[PDB]
Design a protein around this nucleic acid. Structure first.
Ligand SMILES: [Zn+2]
Lengths: 49, 49, 49, 99, 1273, 27, 49, 49, 49
RNA sequence: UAUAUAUAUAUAUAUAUAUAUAUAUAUAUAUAUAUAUA
RNA sequence: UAUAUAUAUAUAUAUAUAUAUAUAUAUAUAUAUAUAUA
């Protein structure tokens, strides 16, 4: 059904639509905390070994 | 002596009969089918925490 | 299979092949972008083989 | 997988609508003097387990983690092996599988 | 249970029957009904002695503190006002006073009393102030007590009777016995304690007794005194007790409600006190549920199809809930608690909040809790003095913060002024919008079509009406001698009567009469001030036509009237469900008082100017609806003034603007008050019926659109808000109807808008409305309120309090109704308990008890004889109430969704078939010659032994008396007829069309010998229908009543052993039920509160079928061929006849005659007749030809697909070949499917596949007989 | 509180009743 | 309306230099349909005529 | 498309082609005269391009 | 009837190097937007003037 | 009587949630004192 | 008299820590009831 019943807006511009969609997702340091955790993990692992 | 005792006997004893004079065993049987379908739902759509 | 029904079956199958669905285009051109962006958002990075 | 799927479904511009397919189906002319109507059968088969239509996004999300988990066709959807090709409901199931 | 022992023997039997112990029978049915009508009502209270209550409730003596009434009333300017006690000018309701001193004693019942004849005489004759004040107080106090469908004590008796014995379990695995039990209900204990004050020798004198003429009171001894508020408190307590039992709530919540009522009753003005703290419960529960951390659950996934104008929605799965989706708006605890502190009820809030905190996740329990707590608000129909009501509501004028400067107008055009182009702002937007619509209306040959003209004139006439006296005066004043038809016994104030008088007169002569007084009426409400009904006279209603037409065009061609087409009200159900889903943010808005805020100084002047200018495009000399073009002076140019002609439409505007500027002049004549009629004008728009919704909805949409696109972006601050506020438009973001409106935001990307921006947005909207004097009264609580429907996270919440079990509105001092009407009240009462999802098993038990009491009644001649009668209980089965237990069956196997009428009978018999046949064979000798459906076993005698036929035919009998004719009055009947026809047939072409059609029709029907006497809908009978309606609106004479009782009894006593021909044939079909259908949705997800595994049957029915009406291929038959019809005739009759003719294979000219009989011209008649075909017709469309319809109870379910591809009329491997419909299946199969699905819906439990298995006669024989019957009727 | 008619098992919350009812009751 | 459109079209010719008559957008076959969808085909026929 | 329906559709179209309508003659021969006369009557003379 | 901005610009001319008037940042059309979005087009026109 | 299984109750330990009390921090309101302005 | 700031005292709300009580879940022990085996 999903394959055969796919439709969109009449005059969609993908670049514009995704521009609005992704706007709130890159407003904070969220992606960077995992980087910091990875570093601490590295130090902890080496020291433990 | 009581409709209660009769009803309990019908549910318990004639649990799988198909006589037209009896209704309740059939409905209970339908409910059992209902539950089996319910299993088919979540078996391909479980619940996450 | 009686041909009248046989004629009907090939008819309905033909109808499905003629539906102007959008999904095939979306798979080829737009879905990869959505994945590529979201890959940087999920708490767990993608893990492929 | 669930996290990605729900997140993915939020941003997409694609929308699903079973109605368009049904119209294409029902507009087929047929005779009323036949004992079996293929139209009714396929319509009955076409409706999913529930009115769910969520498995599609589940398949998309799985690709990002195929190393961890693999989607598989539901076993109950397979046509019964004892049947023959002339048994129409079995035939339709085979068509949906290959699609 | 010693209480069961306390009941008299017949009632004990009835309780056993209701409990399911024994099959019900007419014998015990009468004994119970009879004994209730003979014993004094106080005994019901006496029953309460045998309940060992164990609840922590204390009734403070503070209740019995009657405040003197004399200081609560005064007369000034010769009108009896309310003089509120507190400084609040709204304390205009019934005070808390001791009525005692104003009582005499009755000769029939010496204990109770009524008003002093001396007081009413002096108030009438002497107009003495204190006499009048006492009278007014007595009248309204009695009226407030009368706002019940019947005496509350009877309802309490019902509750005790059903609750006296636990119901027997059925065999169903989901039949949970009741968890709640008596001796734990605070309400009943409260009733006990308070009633202890009203006993002198263990007699329990009721504080009041309701009668057809109001209510009487008991004279207190010298020691005691009765405060009227106590009676009201009892009703609320009884109503709460019933509701709590049916909703099956915890005693703690009921405890809070009791304390709620007690605190209100303790203070003065019980009504006012309740009204002030009304919204406390919904705010505590509905507005704030999931403002915590442990949030989660499952929620519906609803999608709105692309052509959003169509309002089509699709269920497309479920969505997991998580914290990111939890509601964003602030809770409502702080304001509510602050309010409760005023009445020192903070404990209630603490209890509610603590209990609420036990539901962190959205599931059945959470919504069930919400349903129960919200069911605690008082269900009393509040009533106040109409004089105070009219004085308090219409005394308001809107406050405009930036009025249109006088220099913004052009020179006058006789009455109107056009708007200068240089003026901008919202007013300019409003002006252009109306002007554009007026232009479109201007050139439109849709009007001047004689048929359409007939529709408009006919639309103006109804059985009700008003202002006839003003009409007769104004025209008599101008020398116009109107006709009279009094001998034709029809009310003068009926809009029909005045219309007949007007028929002959040239219209322009009547123009002076439009500036005449308009009478008024009041209709009380449950949770707000009473509504207003302001019926214009027929002439005024005619003049205002352009205003309506333009408004309609604005609605139908911009935002598609925002559902104001009202085609089926259920289209708002999926809308609010979608609006309440987690991904969407919704805001509830509504004009504070749209009727009171629309006015001429700002609004109507702009509209009048725009309409008058918008009509300039068009022939200046073109009369409209008999209004000719005229010459008016144009003064736009100070240097070159002149006069020019203007079309009739503009002339209408000229007068219409004059009327609006003058303001409406109402005349109040309230009956509850004493000798205080007067008249005063106001700018308040009439807004008495749906005819006003068009104007307010149009203006509502216009202002909202301008706000969104212009005002807000120019004024708001948040850049993010601007980004999301843009790319938004009303056609896909806003709906409304009258004042009510819904605004929903575009889906914030996987996120929600900051409450900060929301506050900024909501604040600016308030100011925007303040500009032109609209108080917007907005709120944001992540819920859906629209047309009094409530949805939370895609689950509908029935607000049961708005349908109190005991309460009923009565707008007059007298009930003015006859006994048999009570039956229809019962039927309507029961259905609400199905629409709202209550405990279906217990609700059914209570319903039957109500039916039993209603089953019996009598009447007495004004001087002469008495009369009496009562129905066999089988009537109510035919009327649509499932039986609890049939002989030989098991109790509680019939679902509430069982259809009424023949369908319900057929389904019941179909299930009951085999037992009846076998049992009849053993019990009775065989009948003398073979039967089509039965063997020789002769079940019909057995059915007669059960009195089935008696009930079946009794329900067919009419229940309102008929007025009698007269011959000199028939000269007036003809005079009434002639004029009604004259008013209807203004032109001649329509009359020629109808006459030709009728002449051809009867000629064909007889000569072709289809049949004779076929009552075919035709225009010539429309005046006849009007006349009958007009005469029916009158109070019948006693002779008609006596005829009714005699006829009813004879119909009961006449021994008949046959149903209708249709039902006889329907019994020939055998239907069986297979397995359960595949589920629609996940059973976990709640869709309607209370439709949960506890309330199994509703939970089954909804889960299997799914609620969202989703007729993707069926369209439920709304495509009727005749889109345009005149009032009076029934479309459902017309299409039924047409299809019936088509099945009968009538020649085309037969269709031509029928179509021409309702005004269709020959060309369009041929065009319409060609469209008729068995193919494009829908299942229900064709099935209705034999009166097989869909029960109203099903209107909330997605039955389309089931009927389409789940009710097998011919399964190859099961059906006997004898039942093969063959070629006639094109019109046979829908009938069988309808019968099948009706039987399937009848039984309890999950929905199963329905299959025809056998027809005793051949399917051909069945079709042949059906064709015969179709030809006969 | 809530109870199952087949085994008399009693449940504090309805969700527990539902999951039990659907899963625990079926020569 | 006794086919006001026909007379409206004729009148427009006299002032074609000022106003032009256009076919209403709604009176078009939806672009998502196939030729086999009969109502769409009839619509296209009327537009051509 | 089932041929029976196809046979019907070509039939009705054929019927339309055979209707002896008067309009085409009126357009070519009589309507211009009506315009030519009325052009001297309307308060605004024709304005063409 | 204020027109503060116009006079502000003129005044700022005499004090450039101490205060500089700039076009409002939010007056620009959104970057993701396209030329076909008329409200954005007007913004660009006013911005240019 | 002993063993096993199921249910209920009590006691102990662990975990979660709610309520009350005490201490610390923050915010709001009220009262008092000081300073400044009107 | 009003407004603003600072300090002190009291009350309310929120967060953290400690103690007590209640409810739910898990584990262990004891008692009672039911079923099965010896
Ligand atoms: Zn169980």
């Amino acid at each position: 059904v999903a394959m055969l019943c796919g439709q969109t807006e009449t005059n969609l511009i993908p670049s514009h639509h995704y521009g609005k969609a992704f706007a709130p997702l890159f407003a904070s340091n969220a992606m960077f905390t995992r980087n910091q955790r990875a570093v601490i993990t590295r130090e902890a692992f080496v020291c433990a070994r | 002596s009581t409709m209660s005792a009769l009803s309990e006997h019908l549910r318990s004893d004639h649990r799988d009969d198909a006589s037209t004079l009896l209704a309740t065993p059939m409905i209970n049987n339908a409910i059992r089918s209902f539950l089996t379908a319910w299993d088919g739902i979540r078996i391909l759509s479980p619940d996450v925490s | 299979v009686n041909d009248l029904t046989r004629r009907t079956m090939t008819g309905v199958m033909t109808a499905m092949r003629q539906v102007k669905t959008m999904t095939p285009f979306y798979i080829q051109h737009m879905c990869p972008t959505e994945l590529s962006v979201l890959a940087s958002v999920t708490v767990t990075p993608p893990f492929q083989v | 997988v669930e996290a990605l799927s729900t997140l993915l479904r939020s941003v997409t511009p694609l929308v699903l609508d079973p109605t368009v397919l049904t119209n294409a189906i029902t507009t087929i002319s047929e005779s009323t003097t036949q004992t079996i109507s293929p139209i009714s059968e396929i319509l009955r088969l076409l409706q999913p387990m529930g009115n769910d239509y969520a498995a599609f996004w589940k398949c998309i999300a799985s690709w990002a983690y195929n190393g961890l988990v693999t989607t598989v066709l539901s076993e109950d959807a397979f046509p019964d092996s004892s049947q023959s090709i002339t048994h129409l409901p079995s035939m339709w199931k085979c068509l949906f599988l290959t699609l | 249970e010693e209480l069961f022992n306390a009941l008299p023997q017949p009632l004990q039997q009835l309780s056993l029957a209701l409990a399911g112990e024994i099959p019900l029978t007419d014998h015990i049915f009468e004994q119970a009904a009879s004994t209730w009508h003979v014993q004094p009502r106080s005994l019901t209270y006496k029953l309460l002695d045998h309940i060992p209550f164990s609840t922590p409730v204390v009734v403070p003596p503070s209740i019995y503190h009657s405040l003197d009434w004399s200081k609560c009333f005064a007369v000034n300017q010769d009108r009896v006002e309310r003089v509120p006690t507190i400084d609040d000018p709204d304390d205009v309701y019934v005070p808390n006073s001791d009525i005692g001193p104003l009582l005499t004693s009755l000769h029939t019942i010496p204990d109770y009393g009524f008003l002093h004849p001396a007081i009413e005489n002096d108030a009438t004759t002497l107009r003495a102030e204190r006499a009048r004040c006492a009278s007014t107080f007595y009248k309204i106090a009695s009226s407030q007590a009368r706002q019940v469908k019947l005496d509350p004590i009877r309802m309490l008796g019902f509750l005790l009777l059903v609750q006296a014995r636990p119901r027997v379990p059925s065999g169903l695995v989901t039949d949970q016995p009741t968890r709640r039990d008596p001796t734990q209900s605070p309400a009943l204990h409260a009733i006990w304690q308070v009633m202890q004050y009203y006993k002198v020798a263990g007699v329990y004198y009721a504080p009041a007794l309701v009668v057809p003429s109001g209510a009487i009171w008991w004279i207190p001894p010298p020691g005691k005194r009765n405060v009227v508020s106590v009676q009201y408190l009892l009703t609320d307590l009884i109503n709460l007790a019933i509701l709590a039992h049916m909703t099956d709530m915890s005693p703690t919540l009921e405890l809070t409600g009791v304390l709620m009522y007690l605190r209100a009753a303790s203070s003065h003005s019980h009504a006012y006190t309740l009204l002030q703290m009304k919204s406390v419960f919904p705010a505590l529960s509905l507005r704030s549920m999931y403002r915590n951390k442990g949030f989660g659950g499952k929620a519906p996934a609803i999608e709105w199809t692309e052509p959003r104008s169509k309002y089509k929605f699709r269920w497309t799965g479920v969505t997991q809930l998580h914290d990111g989706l939890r509601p964003r708006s602030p809770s409502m605890d702080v304001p509510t608690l602050e309010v409760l502190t005023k009445y020192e009820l903070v404990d209630i809030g603490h209890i509610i909040i603590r209990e609420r905190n036990a539901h962190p996740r959205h599931n059945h329990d959470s919504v069930r809790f919400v349903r129960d707590v919200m069911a605690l608000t008082s269900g009393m129909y509040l009533v106040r003095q109409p004089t105070m009501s009219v004085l308090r509501e219409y005394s308001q004028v809107p406050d405009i913060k930036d009025p249109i400067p006088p220099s913004a107008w052009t020179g006058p055009i006789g009455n109107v002024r056009y708007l200068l182009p240089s003026v901008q702002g919202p007013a300019r937007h409003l002006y252009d919008t109306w002007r554009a619509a007026a232009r479109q209306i201007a050139q439109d040959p849709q009007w001047h079509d004689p048929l359409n003209q007939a529709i408009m004139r006919a639309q103006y006439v109804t059985a009700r009406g008003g202002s006839s006296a003003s009409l007769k005066f104004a025209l008599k004043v101008t020398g116009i001698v109107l006709p009279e038809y009094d001998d034709s016994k029809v009310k003068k104030s009926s809009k029909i009567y005045q219309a007949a008088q007007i028929a002959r007169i040239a219209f322009m002569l009547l123009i002076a009469a439009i500036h005449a007084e308009v009478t008024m009426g009041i209709r009380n409400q449950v949770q707000r001030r009473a509504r207003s009904i302001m019926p214009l006279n027929v002439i005024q209603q005619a003049i205002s036509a352009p205003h309506t037409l333009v408004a309609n065009y604005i609605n139908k061609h911009m935002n598609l009237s925002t559902t104001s087409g009202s085609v089926v009200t259920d289209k708002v159900i999926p809308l609010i469900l979608y609006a309440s889903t987690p991904p969407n943010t919704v805001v509830n808005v509504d004009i504070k008082a749209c009727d009171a805020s629309i006015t001429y100084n700002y609004f109507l002047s702009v509209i009048c100017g725009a309409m008058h200018e918008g009509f300039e495009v068009g022939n200046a000399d073109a009369a409209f609806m008999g209004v000719p073009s005229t010459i008016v002076s144009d003064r736009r140019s100070s240097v070159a003034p002149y006069s020019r002609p203007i079309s009739g439409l503009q002339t209408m505007v000229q007068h219409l603007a004059d009327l609006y500027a003058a303001g409406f002049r109402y005349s109040v004549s309230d009956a509850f008050s004493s000798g205080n009629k007067f008249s005063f004008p106001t700018s308040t728009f009439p807004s008495g019926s749906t005819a006003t919704s068009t104007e307010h909805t149009a203006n509502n949409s216009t202002m909202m659109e301008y706000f969104l696109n212009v005002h807000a972006p120019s004024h708001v601050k948040s850049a993010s808000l601007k980004r999301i506020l843009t790319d938004m438009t009303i056609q896909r973001n806003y709906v409304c109807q009258g004042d009510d409106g819904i605004l929903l935001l575009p889906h914030e990307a996987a996120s929600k808008i900051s409450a900060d921006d929301m506050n900024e947005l909501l604040t600016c909207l308030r100011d925007y409305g303040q500009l032109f004097g609209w108080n917007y009264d907005i709120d944001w609580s992540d819920t859906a309120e629209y047309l009094k429907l409530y949805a939370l996270m895609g689950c509908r919440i029935p607000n049961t309090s708005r349908h109190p079990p005991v309460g009923k509105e009565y707008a007059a001092p007298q009930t003015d109704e006859i006994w048999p009407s009570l039956i229809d009240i019962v039927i309507g009462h029961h259905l609400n308990g199905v629409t709202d999802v209550l405990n279906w098993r217990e609700w059914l038990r209570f319903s039957w008890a109500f039916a039993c009491y209603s089953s019996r009644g009598g009447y007495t001649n004004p001087k002469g004889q008495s009369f009496s009668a009562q129905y066999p209980w089988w009537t109510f089965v035919y009327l649509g109430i499932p039986p609890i237990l049939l002989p030989g069956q098991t109790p509680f196997i019939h679902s509430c969704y069982m259809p009424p009428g023949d369908q319900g009978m057929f389904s019941i018999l179909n299930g009951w078939r085999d037992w009846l046949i076998s049992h009849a064979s053993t019990t009775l000798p065989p009948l003398r010659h073979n039967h089509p459906v039965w063997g020789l076993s002769d079940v019909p005698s057995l059915l007669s032994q059960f009195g089935v036929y008696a009930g079946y035919h009794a329900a067919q009998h009419y229940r309102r008396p008929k007025p009698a004719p007269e011959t000199a009055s028939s000269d007036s009947i003809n005079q009434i007829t002639s004029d009604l026809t004259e008013y209807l047939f203004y032109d001649s072409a329509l009359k020629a069309r109808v006459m030709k059609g009728r002449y051809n029709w009867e000629r064909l029907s007889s000569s072709l010998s289809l049949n004779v006497g076929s009552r075919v809908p035709s225009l010539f009978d429309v005046p006849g229908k009007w006349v009958a309606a007009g005469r029916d609106a009158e109070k019948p004479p006693p002779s008609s009543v006596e005829d009714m009782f005699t006829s009813l009894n004879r119909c009961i006593r006449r021994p008949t052993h046959s149903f209708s021909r249709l039902l006889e044939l329907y019994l020939r079909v055998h239907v069986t039920l297979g397995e359960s259908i595949p589920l629609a949705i996940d059973p976990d997800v709640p869709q309607v509160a209370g439709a949960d595994p506890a309330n199994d049957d509703h939970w089954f029915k909804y889960t299997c079928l799914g609620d969202i009406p989703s007729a993707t291929r069926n369209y439920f038959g709304e495509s009727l061929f005749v889109g345009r019809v005149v009032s009076g005739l029934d479309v459902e009759a017309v299409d039924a006849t047409l299809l019936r003719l088509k099945i009968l294979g009538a020649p085309p000219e037969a269709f031509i005659a029928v179509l021409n009989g309702i005004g269709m011209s020959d060309s369009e008649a041929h065009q319409i007749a060609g469209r008729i075909s068995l193919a494009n017709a829908q299942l229900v469309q064709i099935a209705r030809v034999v009166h097989l319809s869909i029960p109203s109870s099903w209107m909330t379910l997605n039955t389309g697909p089931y009927i389409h591809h789940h009710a097998y009329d011919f399964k190859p491997g099961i059906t006997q070949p004898s039942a093969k419909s063959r070629d006639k299946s094109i019109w046979m199969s829908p009938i069988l499917k309808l019968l099948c699905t009706s039987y399937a819906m009848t039984v309890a439990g999950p929905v199963r596949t329905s299959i025809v298995t056998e027809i005793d006669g051949s399917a051909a024989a069945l079709s042949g007989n059906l064709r015969v019957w179709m030809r006969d009727v | 509180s809530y109870v199952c008619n087949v085994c008399n098992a009693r449940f504090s919350t309805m969700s527990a009743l539902s999951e039990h009812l659907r899963s625990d009751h079926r020569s």
